[PDB]
Amino acid sequence: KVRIGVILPAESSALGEAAAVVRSGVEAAAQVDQSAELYSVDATGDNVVERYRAAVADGVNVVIGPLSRDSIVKLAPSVTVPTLALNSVGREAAANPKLYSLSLIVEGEARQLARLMRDDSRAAPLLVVGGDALSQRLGKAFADEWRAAAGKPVRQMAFDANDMAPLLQAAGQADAVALALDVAQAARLKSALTPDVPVYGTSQLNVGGMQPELAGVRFIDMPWFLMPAHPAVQRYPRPAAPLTRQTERLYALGIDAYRLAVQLAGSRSGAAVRLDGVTGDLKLGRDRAFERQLPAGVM
Numbered sequence: 001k002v003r004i005g006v007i008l009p010a011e012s013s014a015l016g017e018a019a020a021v022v023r024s025g026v027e028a029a030a031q032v033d034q035s036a037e038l039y040s041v042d043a044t045g046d047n048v049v050e051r052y053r054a055a056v057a058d059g060v061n062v063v064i065g066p067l068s069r070d071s072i073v074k075l076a077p078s079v080t081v082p083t084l085a086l087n088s089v090g091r092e093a094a095a096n097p098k099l100y101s102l103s104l105i106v107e108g109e110a111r112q113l114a115r116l117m118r119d120d121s122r123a124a125p126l127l128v129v130g131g132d133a134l135s136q137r138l139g140k141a142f143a144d145e146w147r148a149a150a151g152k153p154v155r156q157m158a159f160d161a162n163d164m165a166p167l168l169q170a171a172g173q174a175d176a177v178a179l180a181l182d183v184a185q186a187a188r189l190k191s192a193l194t195p196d197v198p199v200y201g202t203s204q205l206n207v208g209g210m211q212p213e214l215a216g217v218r219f220i221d222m223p224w225f226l227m228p229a230h231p232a233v234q235r236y237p238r239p240a241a242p243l244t245r246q247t248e249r250l251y252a253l254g255i256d257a258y259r260l261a262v263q264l265a266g267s268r269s270g271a272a273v274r275l276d277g278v279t280g281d282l283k284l285g286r287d288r289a290f291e292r293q294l295p296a297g298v299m
């Protein structure tokens with residue numbers, strides 16, 4: 001049977017707090033599904049190859065990890081069993097057909113949001129984009145996808161906190177608003193916009209706690225949050241600790257990493273592997289990354 005090596009950074013890594021949450025999700029899924037044995041070791045960077053090697057030497061037949069970008073690059077040439085990294089394989093990583101990725105890459109959500117809005121017959125949306133790095137990545141990805149689908153650019157405006165009038169005028173001519181904007185500014189803008197204009201965002205907006213200013217915003221996020229009656233979502237326990245949405249996403253990532261690992265151990269390749277993931281519907285796409293198709297919700 002299936003022996004999964006769970007090779008993630010130790011507590012003191014800058015990624016160690018995230019790694020512990022991911023581990024707790026992997027464990028939760030293993031306890032429910034009981035389809036595999038876990039072999040857990042801490043490793044990152046300078047020792048990741050050696051400890052990966054020793055996990056394989058000990059009979060591991062699929063691996064979850066690594067987490068850091070730099071560990072992925074160092075490891076790729078040595079990958080000899082199906083290995084599910086939890087970050088992008090960067091451009092510098094060596095090509096290796098047994099190396100796969102599952103991650104929460106934000107561009108994926110932006111692309112989907114453009115597709116959702118097309119489905120919803122938004123003909124002339126306004127894309128509003130913040131100044132922080134995540135928002136700017138989202139906005140580019142949204143805009144590229146919109147252009148691909150519509151064959152014309154989306155109207156795009158830089159958010160201006162000190163002079164919102166021009167944006168409100170542009171928003172008045174639009175049949176929806178797409179936000180790639182930090183949650184604080186998004187809430188301010190939602191309160192200024194006409195109350196009835198459809199407003200959309202990614203999981204960027206779903207931070208947790210009381211968010212009364214964002215009520216009615218349509219967004220995409222994990223089944224784990226949006227679909228309590230999804231068959232996979234229901235069978236796994238919620239985390240013991242109340243987590244931020246950010247962190248709980250990592251717990252859910254752990255659950256699906258476990259589930260994908262079990263399939264990857266049992267398949268000729270990733271290409272035939274699909275999953276009704278708690279993090280989204282999963283299937284292999286570019287860069288041997290499992291892309292995540294997300295349900296819509298209303299804040």
Ligand SMILES: N[C@@H](CCC(=O)N[C@@H](CS)C(=O)NCC(=O)O)C(=O)O
Nearest residue numbers: 086087088089102103104105106253
């Ligand atoms: N490729 C990105 C940077 C790397 C990146 O976006 N990584 C994602 C996943 S590949 C991440 O930061 N975290 C997701 C996770 O580890 O779950 C860029 O355009 O700057």
